[model samples]
Every structure is written in structure tokens, then in C-alpha cells.
Target chain A: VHLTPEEKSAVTALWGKVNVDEVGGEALGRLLVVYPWTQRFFESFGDLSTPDAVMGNPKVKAHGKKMLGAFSDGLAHLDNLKGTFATLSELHCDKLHVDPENFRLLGNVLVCVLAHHFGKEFTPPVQAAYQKVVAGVANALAHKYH
Target chain B: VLSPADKTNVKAAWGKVGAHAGEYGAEALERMFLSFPTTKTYFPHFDLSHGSAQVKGHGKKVADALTNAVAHVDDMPNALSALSDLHAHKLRVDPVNFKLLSHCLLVTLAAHLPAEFTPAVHASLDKFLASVSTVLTSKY
Candidate 1:
């Protein structure tokens, strides 16, 4: 899908935050390296739900709950990491470990992915709203950790 | 070997391990081999020894990407869409082989972390493996 100006602007703004410099080939190489791990991670696991027969197995049932918890935990960790970016950016990097330039580039890449996946229906305003919340947490992380 | 609760505990422990991209990336290759020794048969032609470094590097990249992907999970359509395209086009790995590897990983985890690998852990890992498989199938 073609990006609208507003969408482009949104993406650009986000990109500005995490701009990785192309020195020799570091930046381009990093950009090229996208989702292989995600694919491997997803591929390594087989099937989503338990089979009826397997469910009947007491061992299977026990394992099923733990798997669900793991998935949930993974999701939560992602949330925490994203929140970390939003807040650190606003605090002016006084408290962040990584350089602001690095954070911005990373954050922008994330925002672009969000824009691409969520589509134009979810606009910059909507994203910014969420960013505000994440920013608050980022600010906290900077103050406490950095 | 595990009761339901014990399995759950094991799964939870692995989940924690999985969440931290940095840690998971470091040990992914070794963990994969440890979990499924038979997997070596599939890559008998290729130099599996180098796979350790290759897999580790790949893991690091994914961790970086996921740092972004996770942040925007609430708006995951674009990320999911991109994933769908990659799975359909770029990735040539076989689905059956994927399943085998996953099973091996779970079994290996169970074997290595015996204290945490209770009945519940097995069940949880099974469910997780299934969920991931479904996503891949749905994408392709």
C-alpha cells in the first residue's frame, strides 16, 4: 500500500529517532537483517493448540498451561521494551544508556513497522497517544536505571 | 516426570528465557542442537559447525527487530503482513522439518532443566509449539 504524506511524515519522524549511520556497511547491513530470527523462532515451534488425544494426556495438559504463560510473558516483555524507548527519547537522553541517535533510529524502525502493520487507519495521532504512555515509562527507566 | 503445576513452572521459566532477546540469541544454536540431535541428519551436507555462529548472529538480528516488533504489537498488522510475505517468499525451509526442530527443542529443554521440566512444562511447550506452527501455516 502507498503511504500518504501524513503517513510518510509519521514514519519519517519515527525514523529520525533511530537513524543508524551507514559507515562502511554497518547501517545498511543492519537494515537488511530483518526478521530471520522471528521466522526461526516461529518455525521452531509446531502447531498452536493441543490435539484432543494429547490433551487427554496428563503430561500434555500440564505442559500446555506453561506454554501459554510463556507466550504471555513474551508479549509482556515486548511491551516493556517498547515503553523503554518512548520515555527515554523525551527525557533528552540525560538518563538513557544508549545514545539518543541510536535510540531514535531504533525507535523509528519500530514505528515504521507499526505503521506498516497497523495500516493508515491507525494514524500518527493514535500512535503518538500510545507513545506518550511509553514515553512516561521510558523516562522512568532512564531515571532509575541510567 | 512433571505434574501440571510443575510443567507450568518449567514453561514459565523458558518463557522468561525467551523474552530476553539478548540471552535467547546467545544460546539459541547450542540449545537447538542439544534439544534435537537428529536435526543434524538434515544438514549432513552443510557444515553444521559454522551453524552455531550463523544462528547466533541471526538470533541477535531478530532480537533487534523484535525490540521494535514487540513495541508495536498492538498495531501488528504491518509486521504480521511483512512476516506473511517473508514466510511465503524468502524462506525455503520445510514445514515438517520445522515441527521436528521445535519438538526437539522442547525435549532438550526438558532434559537439561529437569528441575523445572515438570508435566505442566511439557504441556505448555507443546501448546506454544502448536501456536507458532499455526501462525506459519496461516501466513503461507
Candidate 2:
């Protein structure tokens, strides 16, 4: 759960210049490319044909923004990490009714995405912490399912 | 994105940031409150001004969230959708401040990240950060 001091600074350096909408949309678009089944859930853009078609949709863009925005806030409050995700756990498990396995799949996709996006910046501690956190989140997200 | 060829290349990159940030995530929040003084109102109880346990603790929490996201970088839809609702309903903070706070992250990261900053890295990371901004405001 702890990164080396140098590693921390190295990872911390990637913020700011992030074009969230572009990156988010790209990330979501990529998600669909990997897990098309998710399309059914996207009431707004799920029906679209191509990735370009989906990305072109305003809702698709909105979805990306909404998702990434939460990321920033979530990171800002990591000390309360469990609680931060608890709110999400309720919705996914109780309301959205997402499959528990899908949550695990989602975690896999995210780890890959981070690796691809971060390039050289991806480090051991970063990967470990993220995986551990992902497991914790997956636990909460599908607590009821299992 | 889902890069097939370069998957393992960046495997731990996001992890390092999220995990490492867990230790100093508050510095980003501190910068956010500093640049946008009004943001402190949302977290009036925290000692973000000069630095307090709550402030530092909150910062660590943010970093933890980053770890969560990076940990699940592949499944953004489920993750983002689930958390966005939390921000909208539970946290109830103005989405705009996240935009402001994001700026703080950039500054803090610049200070801590690598050498000052690079255009490509900035553009790449900035583009990614922009996505978060869109998500934060989408509900509003």
C-alpha cells in the first residue's frame, strides 16, 4: 500500500495536463471495444454501432466525463478510500445490479488501461496498490452477489 | 486505453501513481484549496490551510481512490458510473471544484512527478485528467 518516496513523486507528476474528456471518452470507448456487453447498460450510447459512432454521441462523451470526474474526487479522498467506494458499492450491487464477475472483469480491464496509458511511469508499487484497491472495490461492488 | 501490444509495459505505471500518491495525495488537495480558496468551504472541517490530520488523511484517501481507479483501469464504465452517483448523491460537492482541484493535482504532480514536466506527458496526462472533469460535471 506504500510506494517508495521516489516512486510516489514519479507517479504524482502525471496529473494537471490531463484532458479528462478526451481521455475518459477514449478510455470508455476502449472499454466497449473490450467489453461490448457493457453497451447494454449505457442507455444513452449502448445502441450505437461503431466505437466512433458511440464516441460521437454526446451521451458517450458525458459518460466519460462523469466517470473521470469521480476519479479526481475519489483520489482526493483516498484516506477514506473504503467509504469513498462504499457509495459506489451500494449502487452497483443493489441498484444497477451489475454481475459480480463483471466487476472482476472490469478490474482487469482497468489495470491494462493504466499500463497502456502510463507507459514508462507504471511501477511495481503502483501496480500492487492499485490491484489491492481493485480487489477491495470488487469486494464491495459485488458484496451482495456473492 | 486497451493496448494489446504494450499492456505489460505500463502495467504498474498507474499503480505507482495511485499507490505512491496514497502517501501524499493530500498535497494535491492542499494545492487545490490553496489555488481555489473557496474549495476549502466544501471541506470546511479539514485543516487544509496549514495542514492537519484530517487534511493529510483526506489527501491519502484521495490517493487511495486513485489506486482504486488505476487498479480497475480496464473497467471504467462500471467503476465510473458507480462512483459518479456517489459524488452526485453522497458527496454533493460542486463539480466545478474538481476541475479546480485537478489543476492543483497538476501543479503538485509537476513538483513531485519527474523533471518539471514534458509537453507530451502533460498533453497525455492532461487529456486523461480532462476526462475526469467531464465525468464530475456530467451529473450536474
Candidate 3:
């Protein structure tokens, strides 16, 4: 995914504020709020068969399985993404104890995003609402350290 | 060749598939590797069929954390700061390699999706792909 220059800049700024040594206390506490929200989103799509009812044919199962496979891969890609972010946070924070917590938060967001995208049960509107909320938070996060 | 009745059958099948999302984690990874055979090198000695089990275990840990993240989705600064600390300092997986993996995953998806895949589906996948890329490529 290509990021806008602005988004990149925002991420850079936020990275500048991490204090690894002190991250366990205040940093972890701060992250707790959004982490679970992201997980719920991921869990929502954990099952793909629920939406099979909409497809109405056995033939589609093969196709659906293939699609879900890609969808799950997409979710893995997201997991790696969060892992990358956690790694970056650790480096920038210049500390160690707080890194795991950071990784945990990143994991949460990845799950949320994945669930919203590939979960067959969710309507487009439901996904959109979730994205809107998450994106807004992401944007605010960009400016938080600047 | 699918008749209207067939369509109904397909939807029913999809529901069953959807219900097994978490259970299908290994299948997902195998499908991904099939699409991009090159990624197979990354797994070393691991088998693909059992990969979902591995991922499911990880997914559970991640899911727990994500539940917390959604609760505070509105607080971007705190979230970003926390992420930055882990990524930039603790988990030192190189940003460049992470991005390369993301690119490979996207290419795999493009190659695997069926003809019936809609523009909306592509759009959703693209957004997700991009989000992941950002997380991987970003540096402190």
C-alpha cells in the first residue's frame, strides 16, 4: 500500500516520541484502549462460512474457499504490518520493555482491519463505519506527536 | 452455468466457509504460498497444511490485543506512540523486507481471486493491503 507523503510524515512524527524504557507504564496503559477494539474487528471475520448463505450454490464453495484463502493471507499481511510497526516503535523508543506492548497494540489494529475487509457476514456499510472510525483515529495518531 | 437455485446453494456454502474463518487460517497461508511459490523459502522447514494451526494460535494472541485497540480507536496519538516504540525500538524486523513481503502478498491475491471478484472487493482488499504495507514500511 502506498502512503501519502502526509501520512508518512505523520508516522515519522509519532515515532519520534516513543520512550522505550518508560513504555510499560504510561505507553502500555495508553494503548490498552484501542487494542481490543481492533481485536474485535478481527474476530468478527474469523469465520467465513456464515456469509456462504448469500452465495446460494455449492459450486461457489470452491471459489469462496479460494477467496477466503486470499483473504486470510491478507490478514497475515496485516499481522506482519503490525509487527513491523511494533519493531519500529521499539527502535524509536530506544527502550525494550515497552516493545511487546507496542507489538500487541499493532496486532490488535491488524485484526480489526482484516475482519472488516474479508468477513463475508459484514455488509459494506458495516465495514465502512469501522474504517471511518479507525482511520480517524489513525489520522489523529499521526498528529499526536507533532 | 450456475442457475438461480445454484446461486442459493453457493451462498449457503459461503456461510459455512465464513463460519470457519479462524479454522481456515492454515488453508489461507497455503493458498498464499501457492499463489507465490517464492514465499515458500520463508517458511524453512514448516508445512503449509498445518500453517493455519500456527497462525490460529498467533491469531488468538493478536485478537486479544485487537479487542483492546478498538476500544480506544479514537485516540490516535497514544496508539501511534505505542506502535512506534515497538516497531522502531523493540521488534527490529527490517522495514524494507517487511514491505517486500507485503508486495508479494498483494501480487498473490491479484493472481488468485476469481473472475467474479467485484471492484468493491478489490477496493477493500487494496485498502487492507495498503494499511499493512504502511505498517511494515514505516521507519522511525
Candidate 4:
């Protein structure tokens, strides 16, 4: 997604908030709460139905931050979308056997959580950027899903 | 012995290290070649020079692998075993060099996460490296 001056604001403002672990964790928690199915793929432990699984889970929090970080990276390197998503798509879809339905569901949830967390701060361009980035990541993640 | 706090500190520090992995990884590669010059011999084609692009790229690979392996501890044994085959059999990398690189990588990471890299953090990371050593050298 090419960020115009306006588009960049969406990325910059949201990314600024994403730099905070609190915000990142909250966003990811929201993702797990809304779409519990995504947990089976991302979770290494804890029952998804448990509140701690999404809220207090260290692994979930860590991975959430990582996901936020990936968003920040995606903004800078739209040029390498192929290499970027290909590795992930191959790993999750091929190696890990992550179901696309869940992976794709996470993509929508990811954008929703960010937008919901950002609230008024997420402008039109930011929403567009977030949408594009999440879609790209989700596409890569599910590229090889059988 | 690593305390629970030590483990927490190590994982927290890894979050940042994994984020800035490209830079830290390159630094680790440089340190490895400097401390274990003989290990440089493994890659006649790799240049192995501290500032080389190839070195930097290889450093990223190592950093990425470490991050993945650490994140997926439950599967670590298998991950290490697969790596063992690749390094020991396919690429013919000496397992001892993996130990050397682990040391270099830890020191490099300490430099990267200065405030968080305490004695406890060092111990915890060392324990993880112990796992790395077992898997990397298992095939040998």
C-alpha cells in the first residue's frame, strides 16, 4: 500500500501507539476474545476459552507485540511484500498447517482490533493502510493453505 | 540456576532483540568471526568478513532462527534435530562452531540489550544455549 502524506499518518499514528506494549497487548487480547478460533494456531499453551489464555498469557502478549512490530515493518518495506509474506505463508501454511479460515479470520480481527483500539485516532488513510497491511499478511499466511 | 525473574527478563529482552535482529545479528556474526577465527574457515565462499553483506545476511538468518526456536520451545527438540541434520550432514558445519557462535551471539545480544542483560539474563540465555548445543551437536 502506497502511503500518501495522508496515508502515512494512519501508519504513523497507529504505529506510534503500537510502540507501546500496553496498546499492543490490548489489541491482541481483543483479537483472541472476538475470534477465539485464531488461538489454536497461535497458542502454544493455555485453553483458548480461558480469559488468561488471551488476556494474561505471556506468549500471547509477546506474539501480539511481534505482530504489531510486523505491521510497523510492513509499512517501511512494501517493496518486499513477496519475500516478506512468502516466508510466513510457507511457514504457517505449509510447515505449521495453519488453516486458512482461521488465519484469514485473524487478518480481519487484527484490523478490527487496531482500528477499535485506535478509535478516533485511526484516520481514513490509516484505516486503509491497516486494511492493506493485514490483508497482505493474511494472504501470505494462507498462501499455501490446503 | 536461572530464577523465574531471569527467564522473564530473558524473554522480555528477546522481544527487542528479535525486533532489531538485523543489526544485532550482524554484530553477532562479526563477533563470532573475530573470536573464533578458525570457524571462519567453514565458509570459504562466505567471505566471513565483519562488514560484508553476506555476513550481515547470514547474521539475520541466525537471529531469525534463534527467535523462532525460542518462541516455539515445545517444538525445539525437533527444530534442533532438523537443524542438526542441516548443519552436521548437509552443510557439513562443525557442531563445535555452533557452540562458539552461541557464545558470540549471547555476548552480542547482551551488548544490544544493555539495561536488561543482567547476570540472571545471561544465565537464562546460557541455559537456552545449552539446548542449542545439544541439538546442534547431537548428530556429531
Candidate 5:
């Protein structure tokens, strides 16, 4: 789904006020909570067997920030997504061997986080733009396997 | 304490961390200071500023020590015996601090090198650090 110029502006506008730490932490933390299987990816991280632990872990917070940092990069490089995420795709497909499903899951989770924070301002059109952006990112992140 | 597959994964992950070993150590230590302040109690002699020179140098030492341990996975006790004794005796570093640092190190690696930090690598590295912690805390 290609975002039109207006849709891209909507995304950038919404993203303009995003607090990376808070948004990233909530998104990733909830992903770990809702999808227990994802815990395997963070086995080295501190005790995340419990939802509370997942939320409290500093590693989770830091990694969440890193995750959003990638998203912010994708947003900035929307025109050149493949090049933007080439290294990340290689890392996921070749080295990390992350289940591609997790990318989709995180993408959806990020949408929820945005909706939660933006509330009334995250209008249908804005959400549609974000959905396209998330899909683009997920596709880019998995392109290495393709 | 590492299985054959664990050893392979640890080495491969360490290979990816090759050039940035010290940087990861510094990041880990900085995280330790920020996330768990009690860990800072041991570094009173050095400036505790973010990315301080003393911290970077100490981080380099820590990274080098781990590299040495990686080189001698099978003979870890002998490889780290002196350092272990030093930590246990001279430094009198609390055993708990090692675990904190190890946690921070794993987090630092994952945050910086997400691609290379798969579940298998995480498991292997965690075990590797635990083994290192064991030896370091052995004397005390």
C-alpha cells in the first residue's frame, strides 16, 4: 500500500510528537505480554516470565527504544525502505532467524500503541497511513528471506 | 557448562561483536550505572560520567578478558584463573555485581546487534557469562 503525499504528511505529523521511549516501551512490552512465544527471543534479558517483569526490565525498555529507532528510520526513509532496512533484514533473516510473524505482530502492536497515545487525533486516515507504513516496514524487514 | 551447539553459537556471536567489543562493554557499564545504581558503588575511584575515559578503559579490559575466555571456552578456569582470583581477593567485587554487568552486557549486545542476537545466541551468551561469573566468584 503506497502512501500518498498527504498520507505521508499525516504520518510525519503524528510522529512529530512521539515520545520514543514511552511508545517503544509500551509496544514491545505488550508484544511480549500478549505473545508469550516471543519471550524466546529475549531469553538473555532479565526475568520476563511475568508481565510485570517484562514491563519493568530495563533491557526491554532499551531494546524497545532501539526497535522504535528502526521504525523512525524507516519513516524517514520511506522512499528507500529497502536500502534503509537492508542491514536489518539481513540481521533478521540470516543471523537472528526471527520468525517473520513477529514483525507483523510488532507492527500491529505499534498501531495499538499509537492509538492509545494519540486517541482522538489518530483519525481513520492517519491510521490508514500508519498501517501502510507498518506493512512497508514489515515487508522491508523480511525482504532478505525473499 | 556449555553444550557443543552453545559453544558454536557463543563463538559466532562473539565474532560479530569483534570490533565493537569495548564499545559494547562501555555501553553495558553505562547501562549498569543508569539502570542499577548500586553497581556504581564499586567504581568510586573513577569518574562515573557517561562514557568517561576511565569507564572506557575499564570496559576495554572487560572486553579483552571476555575475548580471552571465548578463546579458551574449554579451558576457561585456567584462562581466567588469575583474573578470577584478583576479582575475588583484591578487588573484593561483590558476586552480585557480576550478574548485573552480565545482564547489561547481554542487553547491550542485543540493542546494538539485533540481527546477530537470536535466541540461540542469547542462550549461549547467557551461559557463557554465567560461567565467567562462576569463576570470578569462585574464591569468595
Candidate 6:
């Protein structure tokens, strides 16, 4: 659960240049594409019946923006990971009944999106470091149930 | 993608749990229901109280399946493929429940097997459970 100094620096550096809205849209958009069952949560988004419709919707874009904004909190509060996500955990677990599994899916898709964008700079070590970050985030978000 | 060491630690931990595995399984399910009350929606038919026979029986079945997964740790996808199909196609349990139950399982193990459930074992078991979950939910 401990990140090395090098990993800390790596995450900070890469995170600074990220376009949260764009990447979140792509991540969540990809999620819906790969796991169509997730589309059930976004029925209000309207016209998500087709892949093209799902990705092009403004509501999905806005939702992705908000989703990535929440994830940014994880980046900012790496030291108090669980504390940062405690409220979110309760909300998703108790109020929303969000399947914790979706967090892992989105986190991983976020990584792949990052790799797609960051290419040359997204080396294996950097990807590994980012994997730990998202894994910690996903686990933290799921910890309320325990 | 489990490492050789992870496999070793997982087998070692399961062995230590041994005869008490089913007891821990039921305790984990109880812990899950208590900590996350909403998760109980998945079991409308079960008596989810602390010590119900139904809970005990279901928990034993879950433990047996987990033990089967542990026995074939190297090829979990095939080992638990039928379960994966059942959950994905028939049971229709939310994939998220797997994560919650996995966390409860770890807490249960750490509580009962404090000495054996070290950080390394904890990590290994987490990976093992997550892998099994991945397999089980993949068919969906």
C-alpha cells in the first residue's frame, strides 16, 4: 500500500497534465462500451442505445467530468486515502448501492486511456505505479463494507 | 497473473484456515450484511441473522467453492467457470458484491487467523479473491 518516492513523483508529474474531462469521458465511455450492463445506471442520459450515441451524449460527458473530479481527490489525498474516500464509500454503499466493482473497471479504463494519451512517457514502471494508485483508490472506495 | 510466492502464501493461509473455513465464511457473510446493510438485498430468502442455519449452510457452500478455487489456484478460470456462469447468467448477483464479500472475507480471516494473515498473506488472498471474482463476473 506504500508508494515509493519515485512513484509519488511519477504520479504527480503525469497527473498535472491530464485533461480530466476528456480522459474521464473516454474512460467511462470505454467502460460502457466494454460492459454494456453499466449503461443501466445512466438511463437518464438518453439515447445511449448505440455505441455512437453513448459516447456522444452530453450527459455522459458531464458525468465523466464529475467522476474524474472525484478521482482527483484521491490523487490529492494520497496520504489519507481511505479518509478521503470514506464519505464516498458510504454514499455508494448505502445510498446509491453502487457496485464497488465499477470503480475497479473505471480505474483500469482510466489507466488504459492514460496510456493511449501518454504513450512514450507512460513506461511500464509508470503504468505499474499508476496501477497501484488506482488499486488503492478502488480498495479505499470499497472499504466501507468491511 | 499471480506470482509464485502469492500462490504459496494463499495455499498456506487456506491450509491454516482448514477445518474452520466454513465458520469463517459464515462470519464474513454476517460481517458483510451488518457493515453494509444494503447488500442484504441479494438474499431475500435467507435468514441473515447472526446465527441462522440458512446462513450457515450457504456459507459452507461458498467456503467449499472457495476451497475448490484454492485447489486449482493456477487455473481459476476453468476451476470456477461453472460458478462464474451461474453468478453471471443465473444468479445475476451484482459484480460489486464480489468486492464487498472479498473485503469481508479478508477481515474475517485477519480476525480469526491473525498470525497467519500477515501483510503478505493479506495481499495474496486479496489478489486471489479478486482473481476469482474476475473470473466469476467475466461471463456477464
Pick by lDDT: which candidate is best? 6
Model 3, range B66-135, lDDT digits (tens) per residue?
Answer: 2233333333235445564565667654554443343333222333333322223333333443444354
Candidate topping DockQ: 6
Top candidate, metric TM-score: 6
How high is the CA lDDT of each candidate model? 0.40, 0.56, 0.36, 0.63, 0.80, 0.87
RMSD of each: 21.5, 17.7, 20.7, 19.9, 16.7, 7.8
Local accuracy of candidate 2 as per-residue lDDT tens digits, B10-126: 233343464557545776676556434677778766656545778778778676655555555565445577567767777777876775566445445544555423322433344
Model 6 stretches astray by more than 4 angstroms: B1-140
Tens-digit lDDT track of model 4 for A2-48: 54675556566667656556555655665566445556666564655
Candidate 6 residue-wise lDDT at B107:
95
Off by over 4 Å in 5: A1-146
Q: Which runs in model 2 stand beyond 4 Å of their true positions?
A: A1-11, A123-125, A143-146, B1-140
Give the DockQ-based CAPRI class for model 3. Answer: incorrect
Clashing pairs in 5: none
Lowest summed lDDT over 10 consecutive residues: which window, candidate 2 chain A? A119-128
Model 3, TM vs. native: 0.29
For model 1, the superposed segments whose C-alpha errors exceed 4 Å read: A1-146, B1-11, B18-47, B60-81
- Residue A129 deviation, candidate 3, in Å? 37
TM-score of every prediction relative to native = 0.34, 0.44, 0.29, 0.46, 0.52, 0.57
TM-score of 1: 0.34
Q: What's candidate 6's DockQ score? A: 0.17
Query: For each candidate, what's the DockQ?
Result: 0.02, 0.02, 0.03, 0.01, 0.01, 0.17
Tens-digit lDDT track of model 1 for B18-78: 5445534434334444334554554454344534565666656644443443344333445
- lDDT value, residue A53 of candidate 5: 82
Interface RMSD of each: 18.8, 13.8, 14.2, 19.1, 14.0, 3.3
